[PDB]
């Protein structure tokens, strides 16, 4: 419904080869008519030096997810999307397991998109909330 | 001047072992009485799928830098610091070389710190600006 290109999880995952998403183990996991979901491990790849998930790593997941969501909503023969502004509140710390992010659209304008991204650890409690603004740019 | 603990670059770098900073090649490079500086490579470790520096990777650098700056400003026998809020504007894209971030203090309160972090690529042009709010928490 939201999407122009039907999300293809194998393709989304494969496209991360030789980029930070592959390095951190980001996995696109699910989608429906209103949302796209990806998760990331909480381990030495994504920890800060004190053994907690790095707040920046939460932002990598959020921006990977939202950037991919934008790509799936534009005419990619004419436009590309790049991150313009990002913000996040770090709500709860995580030490292990996986962190899961779900992106939903706030506004898909002609020149900007705004995404709402909610993250939680395996206990299901909110761990981070992010908002991402993407610029839509002529190819 | 700003610092409680004198910054020790070897220690800052060594402390990143088995965390995302080591994985992405973040290197603490310089400091003075008012600032702390670190850089990060722009390559396959930090690219997004289109060959540009991942906006989230800029945020990892900014939050690594600011979190370390906070650690150097508090009494670590009584307090620790964790990221509370982060935001960034993505100004210019980068494809290669290194990205360098400089952190300066905006406010060091008793319960929160606010850091200004400016990033630029090797051409010296501003590429990202971030602002980070850390919570100061009793050990």
Swiss-Prot record, chains A, B:
Gene3D superfamilies the record matches: Hotdog Thioesterase (3.10.129.10)
GO MF term list: 1,4-dihydroxy-2-naphthoyl-CoA thioesterase activity
Membrane-spanning intervals of the chain: none
Superkingdom field: Bacteria
GO terms under cellular component: cytosol
Top EC class of this enzyme: hydrolase
Sorted UniProt keywords: Hydrolase
EC number: 3.1.2.-
InterPro entries per record: HotDog_dom_sf (IPR029069), PAAI_dom (IPR003736), Thioestr_dom (IPR006683)
Pfam families: 4HBT
Family assignment from sequence similarity: Belongs to the thioesterase PaaI family.
The name this protein goes by in its record: Putative esterase PA1618
Organism field: Pseudomonas aeruginosa (strain ATCC 15692 / DSM 22644 / CIP 104116 / JCM 14847 / LMG 12228 / 1C / PRS 101 / PAO1)
């Amino acid at each position: 419904s939201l999407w122009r290109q039907t999300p293809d999880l194998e393709q989304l995952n494969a496209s991360q080869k030789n980029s930070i998403g592959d390095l951190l183990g980001i996995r696109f996991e699910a989608f429906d008519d209103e949302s796209l979901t990806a998760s990331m491990p909480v381990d030495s790849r994504t920890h800060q030096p004190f053994g907690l998930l790095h707040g920046g790593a939460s932002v990598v997941l959020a921006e990977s997810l939202g950037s991919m969501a934008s790509y799936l909503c534009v005419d990619t023969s004419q436009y590309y999307c790049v991150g313009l502004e990002v913000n996040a509140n770090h709500l709860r710390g995580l030490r292990s397991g996986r962190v899961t992010a779900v992106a939903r659209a706030i506004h898909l304008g002609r020149t900007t998109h705004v995404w709402d991204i909610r993250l939680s650890g395996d206990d299901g409690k909110p761990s981070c909330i992010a908002r991402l603004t993407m610029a839509v740019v002529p190819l």
